[PDB]
Design a protein around this ligand. Structure first.
Ligand SMILES: [Cl-]
Ligand SMILES: [Cl-]
Ligand SMILES: [Cl-]
Ligand SMILES: [Cl-]
Ligand SMILES: [Mg+2]
Ligand SMILES: [Mg+2]
Ligand SMILES: [Mg+2]
Ligand SMILES: [Mg+2]
Ligand SMILES: [Mg+2]
Ligand SMILES: [Mg+2]
Ligand SMILES: [Mg+2]
Ligand SMILES: [Mg+2]
Ligand SMILES: [Mg+2]
Ligand SMILES: [Mg+2]
Ligand SMILES: [Mg+2]
Ligand SMILES: [Mg+2]
Ligand SMILES: [Mg+2]
Ligand SMILES: [Mg+2]
Ligand SMILES: [Mg+2]
Ligand SMILES: [Mg+2]
Ligand SMILES: [Mg+2]
Ligand SMILES: [Mg+2]
Ligand SMILES: [Mg+2]
Ligand SMILES: [Mg+2]
Ligand SMILES: [Mg+2]
Ligand SMILES: [Mg+2]
Ligand SMILES: [Mg+2]
Ligand SMILES: [Mg+2]
Ligand SMILES: [Mg+2]
Ligand SMILES: [Mg+2]
Ligand SMILES: [Mg+2]
Ligand SMILES: [Mg+2]
Ligand SMILES: [Mg+2]
Ligand SMILES: [Mg+2]
Ligand SMILES: [Mg+2]
Ligand SMILES: [Mg+2]
Ligand SMILES: [Mg+2]
Ligand SMILES: [Mg+2]
Ligand SMILES: [Mg+2]
Ligand SMILES: [Mg+2]
Ligand SMILES: [Mg+2]
Ligand SMILES: [Mg+2]
Lengths: 51, 56, 185, 159, 148, 49, 146
RNA sequence: GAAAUUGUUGAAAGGGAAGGGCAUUUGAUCAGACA
RNA sequence: GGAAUACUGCCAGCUGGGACUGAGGACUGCGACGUAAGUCAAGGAUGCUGGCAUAAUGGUUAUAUGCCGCCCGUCUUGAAACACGGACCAAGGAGUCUAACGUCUAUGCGAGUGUUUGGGUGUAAAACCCAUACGCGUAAUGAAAGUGAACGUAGGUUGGGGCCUCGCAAGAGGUGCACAAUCGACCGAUCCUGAUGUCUUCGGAUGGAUUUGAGUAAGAGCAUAGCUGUUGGGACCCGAAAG
RNA sequence: AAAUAUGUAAGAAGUCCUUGUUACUUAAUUGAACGUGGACAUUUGAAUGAAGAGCUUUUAGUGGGCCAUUUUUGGUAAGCAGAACUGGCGAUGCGGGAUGAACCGAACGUAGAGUUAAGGUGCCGGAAUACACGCUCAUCAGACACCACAAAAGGUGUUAG
RNA sequence: GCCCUGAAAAUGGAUGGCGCUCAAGCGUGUUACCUAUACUCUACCGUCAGGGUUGAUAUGAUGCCCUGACGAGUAGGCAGG
RNA sequence: GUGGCCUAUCGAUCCUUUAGUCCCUCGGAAUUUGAGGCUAGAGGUGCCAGAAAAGUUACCACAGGGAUAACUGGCUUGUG
């Protein structure tokens, strides 16, 4: 009789998608990325700044 | 007093209200215009194969 | 605004009730409305629609047509169902011992069926015996044999009957129907 | 007054091709046509007998009759708001076999071959054509292909 | 009845269903069958081919009683016997007990043979008969007697 | 004047036909008159049939 | 162009649908370019569209997708049994994309909350208008209209 | 004993027409529930 | 060389202020929080409290203010028109009836159908009852003389609802009315072939033909009534110059 | 020799293996046409869509049109005359162009809230006498599509090149 | 490029009016803001479509109820009053 | 090879006339003339889907028409 919008009604958000509880508990919306150290080659940099 | 002579304005729109019907295709089309000599022998051929299946 | 693809508020174009005010016909409609809703049997759906048909859409079925249908291989012990009138036919000299369910029986048709050992029953009696149309056989009469049909689609080279009151030598056999008078059709 | 003769407005349509006048080559007369074949109509201007009307130029139909020097073709023609069936008696000079379906026959043959090849071991033979798909990812090397810079050029007359 | 006609529905609508442009005038196009060859030709050539002209030969002072000859087919021949007596004759198909059917007394002139009759001898009296009708009657063991 | 697919009609009403219309309103009245006339004739002619 | 819009189930202003990209559909988008705005949707945009304005076509009726049961009862034969399964089939164009996409009723969006960002819509996005292919910028527009 | 039209009395408005639609102020007037 | 910040994007991160709405009316569904019992923001508002109980709210009406509003009807591509009718009010004022018909629908009976020209009878223009005919239908086709509808389960083929068998189902097989397409058979007309026999010119068997018919092939019609449409009638209403 | 338009095809009424009928056809069981029986199921033969598809009867009004973009004929030209495709007006209100049958936006059951279109935000008049870089001074400045007009030729006016 | 000369019509007069000069003018760029019978959500009326419900002991199975979509209109057609 | 290399070169009903078939009818029954039918052409309608047709009105009439001319006004400006 009345459509209730998930993402603002928490109970409806849990009726569908039971994984929402796990997503919120582990803060999967703010996951840290693993650091890398690759650097561009000299050809890439000289082409970018070339006139 | 002079009036309009001819135009095709609005004619295509009228034709698309219910029209543009592809012709209905039938198995066993009519043999109108087929060669009479072929049809004379085809009639005899069909009578012969009708007896064979019935008497089988 | 909506760019409609089809006509709005269009009726289905099929009859959902009899046009008649017959009180007994409405009782049969009520009986088979219930059966069609709660039996999921295709026989009941067909019968319910047949009760809505007009007179020209329910042509009579003669006993000779019934007798021929009972000569089908394996159909000799089935109950013939005719939603309409069953008429008598004296051109046939032998009739089987079948059972026929119909809305109406003419006086001659009933006598012929009974004297052969059969029985004539109504559609409410049929529902009691076969609530799901077990071992039934529905027969329909010819529709295009009606006299009005032969005038439909009149035109050149069509071969249809003209609408005419008096038929004879001087009535629509001149120019237009023979090559000696202008042209033929 | 207006003129609407049988061959009206066919000045260029029925002309022969450039440096292609004269008699018809013999391969036109050696081809065999059977009922149910798909042919397309193109009139030859040097054969005045059994010639189609200008409307059927460039149309495709199905053979329904075979005679001594001609075939019968069925064409669907749009008149008003419907299509009417037209039957044409055309000499073989004005028709040729259509390749709009001859190419389709080999796809039927290949589908049967692929179906039988994978019948013993494979599932989902995927005998359906698909449209062109978006390109996948790739890596473009600059080894020996260093990008060359381009700039717009000024206006020059050079007349 | 007037209360169910569309005239009642048209009250208050100016044109009464006849249109504003064309209107409802007296006799546009003429009266009766006027212009059957000039401006109503298309409606006459179709729906009524053969209307104009003469074909056959005249017959002065026709009397329809001279041509009275109703036809009866074999498939309805046994309906001329009363129903109470049909059954005994059918089950007793033999000579010297063959029913006599006088088709003229039933208002028929000629007997045509279309259907099939039971294999029962029957004496059929008629003014006229077709060739096929006589053969089927004789095939079942009956005879045809000509009367006037 | 001629339209649609309809039978050709021949209704002969081009004279002053409304002046010669006869409606048999006295169908029941004449039946009573004939029965009365037969009764009074039987009484007049004795036991004649 | 009117016919192409009907074939894409875009029959009123601010209606939206998903289209799989092939050669057969790229030519369709060219014909209706001055009448539509389209681009490449992200996972966030797809998730919010289905959750808030997702309706299913069940027996020729528009039914809100408020429970996983109705999705399973209509798309369970294709292996789709939850609202996230339906989203997964959309964002990753899978074997049953056509059935999953046609199941969803055409989205009914409103006008953008912050406006269109241009004084005149009916020019190409490149020329400062609104129509045509705006690539990833479609996500900002749709979320304003959702 | 109706209407057009008119007299008297009472009320109201009126800076080159009058009349109308939506909304509310002011004046006059009025039904409903007091369970 | 190590950071910061800007820009763009994401969060099933948190939280404050404002407006509109409260449809439904026992229970039933999906979930959440809980060891449990139970609870909940989970298939649509409840709890607490005050004033007044009457012209206070509200309705009606007149007027005032803001914004908006050209005279209706008619012909017309186009009317507020410098296009036509209309000063005002009351009453009257225009698709009718009839003969014969098309389509459709309802009703009775059904290879038949129609009692009402007339007779009988009567509580007397009603109601009730009835013989013989006649109309239409049940045979068509030819200008006519004339002839006249089954090789066959009243044919074969393709598609067909329903029913039958098996099967959990999906399906497969069987039978297939109506209807659609097509090839045949039958009757009449036309054009050919011309047997046994002869008032020697009659008779027309048998077998054919890119010919033709408003035909046959287990009948559907007759009667009454209604809307709509047709024709003749004053014929939707009013109107000529004439004869 | 284009562009735009335009014909046909993308399977079950299909493909393949074997062999039955005939008065047609072949030197010839050669071919043609129509069939019996067997094998191949709906990733069954591209995409997208499909308020279902097919079919029949009957009858109203209408048969003076006009306008806009593009193509286009006659004419010096015309709010002129005549064609082509499409969209409109006529038959249609609503927001915008002061005003207007046709232009722009958008098409209408009765209401509430929110957001916009075209067009606008000094005052009339709801909304920034907002922000930013320049140009222009007219003793007849200029001011917004359809649209209610201005040219050839000139100025050490001023600006940039 | 802007401005000016070229540039003459008859009642008094119209960037819509007032008026405006680092504009309230012209070219261009960035934002905020205003409001349609259009879009989004909700209620109510009607129309159409798909469905549920005869089991008595309570009255409309042409009844009651569930679900979805839709609503411009001259000439003209049909339906309910 | 079923007329002209192809794209034009032509004509209903009623009536008349000719050829064919020597067939059908003249209705109380026959013979012979005559007449009427059946099939195929010709004689023509050029306003060419096909009425048989001279003027005048400054003595004039009616139904209508701004669907349409003789004044202004409006658009246009060749011409002036
Ligand atoms: Cl037009
Ligand atoms: Cl009505
Ligand atoms: Cl006011
Ligand atoms: Cl004959
Ligand atoms: Mg015209
Ligand atoms: Mg030639
Ligand atoms: Mg009206
Ligand atoms: Mg009128
Ligand atoms: Mg008219
Ligand atoms: Mg009239
Ligand atoms: Mg003429
Ligand atoms: Mg805002
Ligand atoms: Mg804008
Ligand atoms: Mg008095
Ligand atoms: Mg008064
Ligand atoms: Mg108040
Ligand atoms: Mg006011
Ligand atoms: Mg005011
Ligand atoms: Mg005003
Ligand atoms: Mg005018
Ligand atoms: Mg007016
Ligand atoms: Mg007038
Ligand atoms: Mg006046
Ligand atoms: Mg009155
Ligand atoms: Mg009156
Ligand atoms: Mg009447
Ligand atoms: Mg006179
Ligand atoms: Mg007219
Ligand atoms: Mg004009
Ligand atoms: Mg009009
Ligand atoms: Mg303006
Ligand atoms: Mg303000
Ligand atoms: Mg500016
Ligand atoms: Mg709105
Ligand atoms: Mg609407
Ligand atoms: Mg409406
Ligand atoms: Mg020559
Ligand atoms: Mg005589
Ligand atoms: Mg002519
Ligand atoms: Mg003449
Ligand atoms: Mg004029
Ligand atoms: Mg000059």
């Amino acid at each position: 009789v009345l459509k209730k919008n998930p993402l603002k009604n928490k109970q409806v958000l849990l009726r569908l998608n039971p994984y929402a509880k796990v997503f919120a508990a582990e803060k999967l919306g703010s996951k840290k990325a693993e650091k890398t150290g690759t650097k561009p080659a000299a050809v890439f940099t000289e082409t970018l700044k070339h006139d | 007093a002079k009036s309009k002579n001819h135009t095709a304005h609005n004619q295509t729109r009228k034709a698309h209200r219910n029209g543009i019907k592809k012709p209905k295709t039938y198995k066993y089309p009519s043999l109108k215009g087929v060669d009479p000599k072929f049809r004379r022998n085809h009639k005899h051929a069909l009578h012969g194969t009708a007896k064979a299946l019935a008497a089988a | 605004g909506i760019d409609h693809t089809s006509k709005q508020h269009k009726r289905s174009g099929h009859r959902t009730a009899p046009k008649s005010d017959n009180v007994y016909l409405k009782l049969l409609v009520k009986l088979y409305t219930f059966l069609a809703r709660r039996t999921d049997a295709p026989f009941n759906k067909v019968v319910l629609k047949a009760l809505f048909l007009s007179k020209i859409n329910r042509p009579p079925v003669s006993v000779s047509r019934i007798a021929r249908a009972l000569k089908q291989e394996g159909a000799a012990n089935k109950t013939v169902v005719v939603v309409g009138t069953v008429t008598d036919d004296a051109r046939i000299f032998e009739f089987p011992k079948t059972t026929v369910a119909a809305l109406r029986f003419t006086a001659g048709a009933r006598a012929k069926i009974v004297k052969a050992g059969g029985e004539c029953i109504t559609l409410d009696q049929l529902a009691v015996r076969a609530p799901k149309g077990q071992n039934t056989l529905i027969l329909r009469g010819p529709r295009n044999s009606r006299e009005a049909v032969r005038h439909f689609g009149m035109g050149p080279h069509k071969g249809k009957a003209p609408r005419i009151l008096s038929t004879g030598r001087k009535f629509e056999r001149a120019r237009g129907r023979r090559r000696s008078k202008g042209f033929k059709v | 007054g207006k003129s609407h003769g049988y061959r009206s407005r066919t000045r260029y349509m029925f002309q022969r091709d450039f440096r292609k006048h004269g008699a018809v080559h013999l391969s036109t007369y050696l081809k065999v046509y059977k009922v149910g074949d798909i042919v397309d109509i193109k009139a030859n201007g040097s054969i005045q007998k059994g010639m189609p009307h200008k409307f059927y130029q460039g149309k495709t139909g199905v053979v329904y009759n075979v005679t001594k020097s001609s075939v019968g073709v069925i064409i669907n023609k749009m008149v008003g708001n419907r299509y009417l069936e037209k039957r044409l008696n055309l000499r073989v000079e004005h028709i040729k076999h259509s390749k709009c379906r001859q190419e389709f026959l080999e796809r039927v043959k290949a589908n049967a071959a692929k179906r039988a090849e994978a019948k013993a071991q494979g599932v989902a033979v995927q005998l359906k054509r698909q449209p062109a798909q978006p390109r996948e990812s790739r890596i473009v090397s600059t080894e020996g292909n260093v990008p060359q810079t381009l700039a717009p050029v000024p206006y020059e007359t050079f007349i | 009845p007037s209360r169910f006609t569309k005239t009642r529905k048209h009250r208050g609508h100016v044109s009464a269903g006849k249109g504003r442009i064309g209107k409802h005038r007296k006799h546009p196009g003429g009266r009766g069958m006027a212009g059957g060859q000039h401006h109503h030709r298309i409606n006459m050539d179709k729906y009524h081919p053969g209307y104009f002209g003469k074909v056959g030969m005249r017959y002065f002072h026709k009397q329809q009683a001279h041509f009275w000859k109703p036809v009866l087919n074999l498939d309805k021949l046994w309906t001329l016997i009363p129903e109470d007596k049909r059954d005994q004759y059918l089950k007793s198909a033999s000579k010297e007990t063959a029913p006599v059917i006088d088709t003229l007394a039933a208002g028929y002139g000629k007997i045509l043979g279309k259907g099939r009759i039971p294999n029962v001898p029957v004496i059929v009296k008629a003014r006229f008969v077709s060739k096929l009708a006589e053969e089927k009657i004789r095939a079942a063991g009956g005879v045809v007697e000509l009367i006037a | 004047a001629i339209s649609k697919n309809l039978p050709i009609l021949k209704n002969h009403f081009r004279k002053h036909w409304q002046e010669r219309v006869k409606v048999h309103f006295d169908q029941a009245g004449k039946k009573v008159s004939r029965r009365n006339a037969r009764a009074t004739r039987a009484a007049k002619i004795a036991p004649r049939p | 162009p009117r016919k192409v819009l009907q074939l894409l189930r875009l029959t009123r202003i601010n209606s939206g649908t998903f289209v799989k990209v092939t050669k057969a559909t790229l030519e369709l988008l060219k014909l209706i370019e001055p009448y539509v705005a389209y681009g490449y949707p992200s996972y966030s945009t797809i998730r919010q569209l289905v959750y808030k304005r997702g309706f299913g076509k069940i027996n020729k009726q528009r039914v809100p997708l408020s429970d996983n049961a109705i999705i399973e009862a209509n798309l369970g034969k294709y292996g789709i049994l939850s609202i996230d399964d339906l989203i997964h089939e959309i964002i990753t164009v899978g074997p049953h994309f056509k059935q999953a996409n046609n199941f969803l009723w055409p989205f009914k969006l409103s006008n953008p909350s912050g406006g269109w960002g241009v004084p005149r819509k009916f020019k190409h996005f490149i020329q400062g208008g609104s129509f045509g292919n705006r690539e990833e910028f479609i996500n900002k527009l749709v979320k304003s209209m959702n």
